[PDB]
Write a protein that binds this DNA or RNA. Structure first.
Ligand SMILES: [Co+2]
Ligand SMILES: [Co+2]
Ligand SMILES: [Co+2]
Ligand SMILES: [Co+2]
Ligand SMILES: [Co+2]
Ligand SMILES: [Co+2]
Ligand SMILES: [Co+2]
Ligand SMILES: [Co+2]
Lengths: 82, 226, 142, 83, 142, 224
DNA sequence: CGTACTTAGGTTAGGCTAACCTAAGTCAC
DNA sequence: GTGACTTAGGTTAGCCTAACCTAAGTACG
């Protein structure tokens, strides 16, 4: 309840957040999981969630080691503490 | 129920479906004999290996010359058994098919020949179905004028004479008791009420009362229209 | 030769042997039904498991209450079929038994009742063998 | 029982007897059943059972229409009423 | 891809969708497990027959008391397996879930209790997902 | 009891029978996996169709190169699982085989390679059985004798070296063997017996027990 | 105009019991 | 020796459920 989904944080105008949960849905894509680890979108790490406008729009995130583009269904399946 | 002889009952089910003008799919055999799709395929495969039938392009089952011959000899035994049970033994009309469906698997040609003499060379079963293979044992009437109760009803209905009740309908003894009560039996006139579209319960009025026939049942009753 | 029903043919074979006054051993069934000794031991064990017969100390097979009742209904059907085949259908005297041996496994008690009335209350088969279990049939809806 | 088996009647010294029962064991041989009918070893008919000495010896019988040789196991499976 | 256990993968898929806040429709299972709509409808009806789930008016799938208990035990095995594969065995971060997705179907509650001790009472998977049903395990003979 | 993977368990049962010096008949697969003769022939036929085995002249089952390779990979997964369960996880000795009999069907080669490093290149299972196919992943035992043959040859003192997969299937027996001290690395005294199909008495460090012929046949020792 | 679901016919793997077989091995007399 | 059973390893027919498929519907928004 205190946790929020990356897609909702982006639509709300973005912000800095602590990565808490990566849902089983995301884990089923190894190539994506490697990318998430590389840029530093992993549990315990802080990310910047870029503000987005609309629906079915890719969510831009900045990790400690770089940035990546999450699809709506992926960003929905990542939970953070703002 | 126990088929007594699986192979002979598969052959006769294919023959029944042809007589009813139904495309003999393995799904039809599964429904009627109450067996899984896999069981039917496996059993059909054994009969194909034996050379009694083949699977066609649209996957409908076709009898070979040996398979058709065997299917005819079973249907002959069945309908001679039905004649014996009704005419001589005097078993109740609704119970005769179920008895005959077991007897057809144990009757010798020797007994068939004796029954033809005893019963006076019968040409139809007690349900009006022609008896085949009498030539193989040791003037057939043109039946092209006969129409199915469902097609008659879809064409505006009207009065017709009951001529044939298919093996399919005979399997349900409660329905046969109902048909007999209202007088929807071979040699009786019925009034078929008209219906709009397929897959609709068809109303029929007999001499003693009225009843409703399901599409598959109405399809399996052949009549001659006024 | 297809038995049609293995259980019913084992029960009637043990019944036949008792009528002949022969000791009903597994070896007698093996001879008469033309099956291996191992097949007979195996089938007899199934029928013992299903409560149809027991094996005595001297090894002779004994029909249970349930086994004897089933054996009697098969033999009743057999001998009523023989009467029908000779008296009504007119099948040759020497061919009748082989026919009746198949028919006995498919005849309902409903047909049996109709045959009792048709044949004028028969007490014996055409070969003089008494018809057992006639009182078990009843008259149904009559 | 008042009925007796043909094999036992033969060993006892033979005699005239009324045929009563032909066991299911005999009926399984159609060729034998034809011969039994031909000579007149059938239920309700009288036969003469010839006296025999020993075991496993074929039993000679005389029917109304002639005579036949019954094997011991066949003769055992035919029951008669001795006159 | 081989599910190893069809029932357990249907239960966990419904469980995953609830955790993601997605409506668990048959169509979601069809997409995620890459099976036809007819297969899903059929398997769901079989699981409804066996009392593992029910279908609501809005047609979303609901786990029964028995369904949820089984789903929780599969998910517990899954997330304890992931912790073992990362912290102890040292399998690569991105390859762990696919391994754990097979292991979850063969792990006993006996092994689970030993993994709790070995891993020092873990509360989350390596991906931060809470481990459910830890109180259900107990300590056995310990 | 659920095999998880029928094919892999048929392959591994044939491999077990070879290790035990038993002629791999379909009757052996039937009694061990508790399935009908028809089921075994029907399943063996599917595996012959797939080209994993063949039926020989005396009707004994032979593994093809692909079948042996697959059978080895399963047995390797099984025994690395047993090592992990004993050495690292700490599952009770008598419960390890049953767990490993399921794990062997889901373990990737990737995990096997990681387990080899973690466990320090183990060469035997916790029950003394050699781990095969380690070369494919990336000692002379001809002096070993079977407890039954030793007993039929006058018995004597011997070192327990191997307990076959067959013996591991019975957890109660394995608990008994552990109590009396009939375990790999322990000395036992085998009492002499005449003929075959006779129970074999053995005296361990902590007590004694009787082994059935098929059990004693599946326990390999080195005599004094 | 898709999205979600049902309907119709079918295949495959993996099981089962009943009812037979051949071929040695054993047992009571 | 003989007849009467037991054992050991098979085969075949005739069933089953679970878990998938393609294809062509209907239902609803
Ligand atoms: Co009929
Ligand atoms: Co029939
Ligand atoms: Co008779
Ligand atoms: Co019979
Ligand atoms: Co996971
Ligand atoms: Co899984
Ligand atoms: Co093991
Ligand atoms: Co296994």
């Amino acid at each position: 309840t205190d946790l929020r989904r990356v897609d909702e944080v982006a639509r709300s105008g973005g912000g800095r957040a602590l990565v808490c949960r990566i849902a089983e849905h995301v884990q089923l894509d190894p190539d994506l999981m490697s990318e998430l680890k590389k840029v530093g979108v992993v549990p315990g790490n802080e990310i910047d969630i870029v503000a987005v406008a609309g629906v079915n729009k890719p969510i831009q995130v900045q990790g400690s080691e770089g940035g990546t583009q999450l699809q709506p269904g992926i960003a929905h399946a990542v939970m953070v503490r703002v | 129920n126990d088929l007594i002889d699986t192979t002979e009952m598969y052959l006769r089910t294919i023959y029944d479906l042809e007589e009813e003008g139904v495309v003999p799919l393995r799904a039809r055999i599964a429904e009627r004999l109450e067996q899984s799709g896999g069981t039917v395929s496996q059993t059909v495969a054994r009969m194909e290996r034996d050379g009694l039938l083949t699977v066609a392009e649209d996957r409908h089952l076709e009898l070979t010359k040996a398979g058709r011959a065997r299917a005819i000899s079973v249907m002959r035994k069945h309908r001679l058994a039905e004649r014996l049970l009704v005419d001589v033994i005097g078993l109740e009309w609704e119970q005769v098919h179920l008895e005959a469906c077991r007897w057809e698997h144990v009757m010798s040609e020797a007994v068939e020949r004796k029954l033809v003499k005893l019963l006076g060379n019968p040409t139809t079963s007690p349900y009006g179905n022609p008896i085949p293979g009498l030539d193989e044992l040791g003037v057939e009437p043109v039946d092209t004028d006969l129409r199915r109760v469902d097609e008659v009803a879809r064409s505006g209905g009207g009065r017709a004479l009951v001529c044939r009740i298919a093996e399919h309908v005979q399997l349900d003894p409660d329905l046969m008791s109902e048909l007999k009560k209202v007088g929807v039996v071979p040699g009786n006139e019925i009034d078929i009420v008209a219906v709009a579209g397929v897959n609709k319960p068809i109303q029929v009025q007999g001499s003693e009362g009225g009843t409703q026939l399901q599409p598959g049942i109405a399809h399996a009753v052949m009549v001659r229209v006024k | 030769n297809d038995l049609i029903d293995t259980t019913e043919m084992y029960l009637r074979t043990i019944y036949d042997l008792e009528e002949e006054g022969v000791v009903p051993l597994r070896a007698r069934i093996a001879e008469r039904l033309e099956q291996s000794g191992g097949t007979v031991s195996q089938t007899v064990a199934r029928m013992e498991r299903d409560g149809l017969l027991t094996v005595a100390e001297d090894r002779h097979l004994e029909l249970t209450k349930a086994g004897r009742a089933r054996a009697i209904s098969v033999m009743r059907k057999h001998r009523l079929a023989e009467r029908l085949l000779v008296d009504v259908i007119g099948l040759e005297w020497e061919q009748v038994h082989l026919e009746a041996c198949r028919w006995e496994h498919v005849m309902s008690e409903a047909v049996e009742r109709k045959l009792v009335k048709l044949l004028g209350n028969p007490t014996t088969s055409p070969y003089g063998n008494p018809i057992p279990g006639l009182d078990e049939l009843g008259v149904g809806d009559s």
